[PDB]
Structure 1
Amino acid sequence: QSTKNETALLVAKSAKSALQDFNHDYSKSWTFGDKWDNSNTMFETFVNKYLFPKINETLLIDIALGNRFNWLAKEQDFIGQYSEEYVIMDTVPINMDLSKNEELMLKRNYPRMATKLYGNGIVKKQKFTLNNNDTRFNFQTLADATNYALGVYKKKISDINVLEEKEMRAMLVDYSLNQLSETNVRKATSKEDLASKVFEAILNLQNNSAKYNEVHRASGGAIGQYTTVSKLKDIVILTTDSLKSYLLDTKIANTFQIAGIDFTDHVISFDDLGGVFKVTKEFKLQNQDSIDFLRAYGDYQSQLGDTIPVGAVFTYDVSKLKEFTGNVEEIKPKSDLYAFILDINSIKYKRYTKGMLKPPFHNPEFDEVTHWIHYYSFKAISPFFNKILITDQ
C-alpha cells in the first residue's frame, strides 16, 4: 500500500538527498529548505508540531570475542618456510637361528624413518577505511565519532580471534573426517552411549599401541608400526556443547562417587561444529550477487572471473549461493553425535604477529584514512600421536 501524506512524500523524494550530491561530479550548491510537518506521522509532540525530531544518544554496543586457544600460540620469527619432523619406526627383535652363516654380521641394517613435511603458513589481511565526509553527517557529537573509530578497531581485532577459532575447529574436524583412516573411529549409538565410550577411549590412550596414530600416511611409515602413549595431562577431547551439558547434568550428578573419575577438565566444546566450507572442483566467479554477498563479509578483492583453488575455506554460510552448490562442501559432523579425542602437542599452531599493524594510508583526494591488518598464521596436525574419533557412521 501507499501513503498520500505529504511529508511521507517528502521523505520518498530521495532526489534531494545528500547521496545525490556525492555520486555526481556536479550538484546544487544552495538549499532552500522545506516546510517540515510532524502531523499524521510517527513524529508528533503535543505542543510543537513543526520541529524536526531529536536524537539524544548512541552507545556503540561492543563485545570482545576471545580465542579459546592462544596458549597454543607460540611464535616463530618469520624466516624460512619448510619445517618438518620425523620418527624412527619400530623393530621387533628376532630369534637367534645360529644355522645362518656368520658373514651376515658384515651386512648392514640402517634405521628407518618417517618424516612429515609441512610447508608454509598463510598471511591474513584486512582493510578498513575511515571517511571524513560521509560518515560525519551522522554522529551528533564528535565524541560518538571517536568512540565509533575506536570500536570498529576493537571489533576488527576481535573478529580475527573468532575467525581463527572457528577455522581451527574446522581444521581438526576436517582432519577427523578425511584422515584417521579406519581403526580409530568408533561407532556410538546414542547421546548417552558415547558418554561411556569416551572414557572407554580414554585409557586406550595409555596402552602401548601401534594403532591410534596416523603414521601410515607419513613419508617412510607406509609399511611398519609405531607405538606411542599419552599422559592424561595432555589429552584434549572436543564435542558439541550439548554433550558436555548432558555429562554435567547427568553422569556427574546422578552418580555417587565422582571424587576421581571426572574427566570434565579436558572437555572443550562448541555450539555447532560447522559453519565452515571446503572447495571442490575449482570453479570461478561469474555472477554479480555472489561477489556482492562476498562484499557483506569484507571480501573485497575478488571479482568476476577470479578462480578459487580447491584447498580454500570460506568460514561462513556461503554454499547457498547458486554458483557454489556441488562445488562447496560443509566440514561438519554427520549426525550431531561427535567426540573427537586427541592429545595436545599433536596440533601445531604457530603465528607471527610482530609487525601486525601497518602505518595508515591517508587518501587526500577523497579524504580517508585506511588501515591494514596483517598476521602470518600456521597450523597443522602432527600425525604421530594417538587420536580417536567417536561418531555415528
Structure 2
Amino acid sequence: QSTKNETALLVAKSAKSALQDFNHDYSKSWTFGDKWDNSNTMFETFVNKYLFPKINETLLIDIALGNRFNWLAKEQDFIGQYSEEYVIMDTVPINMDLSKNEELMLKRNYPRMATKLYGNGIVKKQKFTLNNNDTRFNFQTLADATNYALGVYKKKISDINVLEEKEMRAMLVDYSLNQLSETNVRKATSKEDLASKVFEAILNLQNNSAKYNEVHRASGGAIGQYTTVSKLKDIVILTTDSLKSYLLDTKIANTFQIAGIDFTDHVISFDDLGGVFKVTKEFKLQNQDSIDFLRAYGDYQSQLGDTIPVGAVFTYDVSKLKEFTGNVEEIKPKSDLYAFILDINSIKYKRYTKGMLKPPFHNPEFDEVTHWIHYYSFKAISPFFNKILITDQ
C-alpha cells in the first residue's frame, strides 16, 4: 500500500538527498529548505508540531570475542618456509637361528625413518577505511565519532580471534573426517552411549599401541608400525556443547562417587561444529550477487572471473549461493553425535604477529584514512600421536 501524506512524500523524494550530491561530479550548491510537518506521522509532540525530531544518544554496543586457544600460540620469527619432523619406526627383535652363515654380521641394517614435511603458513589481511565526509553527517557529537573509530578497531581485532577459532575447529574436524583412516573411528549409538565410549577411549590412549596414530600416511611409515602413549595431562577431547551439558547434568550428577573419575577438565566444546566450507572442483566467479554477498563479509578483492583453488575455506554460510552448490562442501559432523579425542602437542599452531599493524594510508583526494591488518598464521596436525574419533557412521 501507499501513503498520500505529504511529508511521507517528502521523505520518498530521495532526489534531494545528500547521496545525490556525492555520486555526481556536479550538484546544487544552495538549499532552500522545506516546510517540515510532524502531523499524521510517527513524529508528533503535543505542543510543537513543526520541529524536526531529536536524537539524544548512541552507545556503540561492543563485545570482545576471545580465542579459546592462544596458549597454543607460540611465535616463530618469520624466516624460512619448510619445517618438518620425523620418527624412527619400530623393529621387533628376532630369534637367534645360529644355522645362518656368520658373514651376515658384515651386512648392514640402517634405521628407518618417517618424516612429515609441512610447508608454509598463510598471511591474513584486512582493510578498513575511515571517511571524513560521509560518515560525519551522522554522529551528533564528535565524541560518538571517536568512540565509533575506536570500536570498529576493537571489533576488527576481535573478529580475527573468532575467525581463527572457528577455522581451527574446522581444521581438526576436517582432519577427523578425511584422515584418521579406519581403526580409530568408533561407532556410538546414542547421546548417552558415547558418554561411556569416551572414557572407554580414554585409557586406550595409555596402552602401548601401534594403532591410534596416523603414521601410515607419513613419508617412510607406509609399511611398519609405531607405538606411542599419552600422559592424561595432555589429552584434549572436543564435542558439541550439548554433550558436555548432558555429562554435567547427568553422569556427574546422578552418580555417587565422582571424587576421581571426572574427566570434565579436558572437555572443550562448541555450539555447532560447522559453519565452515571446503572448495571442490575449482570453479570461478561469474555472477554479480555472489561477489556482492562476498562484499557483506569484507571480501573485496575478488571479482568476476577470479578462480578459487580447491584447498581454500570460506568460514561462513556461502554454499547457498547458486554458483557454489556441488562445488562447496561443509566440514561438519554427520549426525550431531561427535567426540574427537586427541592429545595436545599433536596440533601445531604457530603465528607471527610482530609487525601486525601497518602505517595508515591517508587518501587526500577523497579524504580517508585506511588501515591494514596483517598476520602470518600456521597450523597443522602432527600425525604421530594417538587420536580417536567417536561418531555415528
TM-score, structure 2 length as denominator? 1.00
Deviation at 1:148, TM superposition (A): 0.0
Whole-angstrom distance in 1 between the partners of 2:285 and 2:97: 68
Corresponding residue for 1:143?
Answer: 143
Between the two proteins, what is the percent identity of the paired residues? 100
Whole-angstrom distance in 2 between the partners of 1:187 and 1:267: 20
Whole-angstrom distance in 2 between the partners of 1:337 and 1:9: 56
Deviation at 1:191, TM superposition (A): 0.0
Corresponding residue for 2:327?
Answer: 327
Deviation at 1:364, TM superposition (A): 0.0
Deviation at 1:306, TM superposition (A): 0.0
Whole-angstrom distance in 2 between the partners of 1:386 and 1:4: 73
Whole-angstrom distance in 1 between the partners of 2:156 and 2:57: 23
Deviation at 1:222, TM superposition (A): 0.0
Corresponding residue for 1:48?
Answer: 48
Question: SS of 1:76's equivalent?
Answer: coil
Q: Deviations over 1:206-226 (max 9, x none)?
A: 000000000000000000000
Q: Deviations over 1:286-325 (max 9, x none)?
A: 0000000000000000000000000000000000000000
- RMSD between superposed Cα atoms in Å: 0.0
Moved over 6 A (4+): none
Question: SS of 2:204's equivalent?
Answer: coil
Identify unmatched segments of 5+ residues in structure 2.
none
How many pairs align? 393
Deviation at 1:82, TM superposition (A): 0.0
Deviation at 1:257, TM superposition (A): 0.0
Whole-angstrom distance in 1 between the partners of 2:319 and 2:127: 25
Whole-angstrom distance in 1 between the partners of 2:347 and 2:205: 16
Whole-angstrom distance in 2 between the partners of 1:9 and 1:97: 104
TM-score, structure 1 length as denominator? 1.00
Whole-angstrom distance in 2 between the partners of 1:34 and 1:61: 35
Question: SS of 2:246's equivalent?
Answer: helix
Q: Deviations over 1:146-197 (max 9, x none)?
A: 0000000000000000000000000000000000000000000000000000
Q: Deviations over 1:236-264 (max 9, x none)?
A: 00000000000000000000000000000
Corresponding residue for 2:219?
Answer: 219
Whole-angstrom distance in 2 between the partners of 1:99 and 1:318: 69
Deviation at 1:30, TM superposition (A): 0.0
Q: Deviations over 1:73-100 (max 9, x none)?
A: 0000000000000000000000000000
Question: SS of 1:99's equivalent?
Answer: coil
Whole-angstrom distance in 2 between the partners of 1:45 and 1:147: 31
Whole-angstrom distance in 2 between the partners of 1:122 and 1:192: 40
Identify unmatched segments of 5+ residues in structure 1.
none
Whole-angstrom distance in 2 between the partners of 1:358 and 1:335: 44
Deviation at 1:31, TM superposition (A): 0.0
Deviation at 1:43, TM superposition (A): 0.0
Deviation at 1:67, TM superposition (A): 0.0
Deviation at 1:26, TM superposition (A): 0.0
Deviation at 1:104, TM superposition (A): 0.0
Question: SS of 2:250's equivalent?
Answer: helix
Whole-angstrom distance in 2 between the partners of 1:296 and 1:125: 16
Whole-angstrom distance in 1 between the partners of 2:284 and 2:199: 46
Whole-angstrom distance in 2 between the partners of 1:274 and 1:167: 9
Q: Deviations over 1:6-60 (max 9, x none)?
A: 0000000000000000000000000000000000000000000000000000000
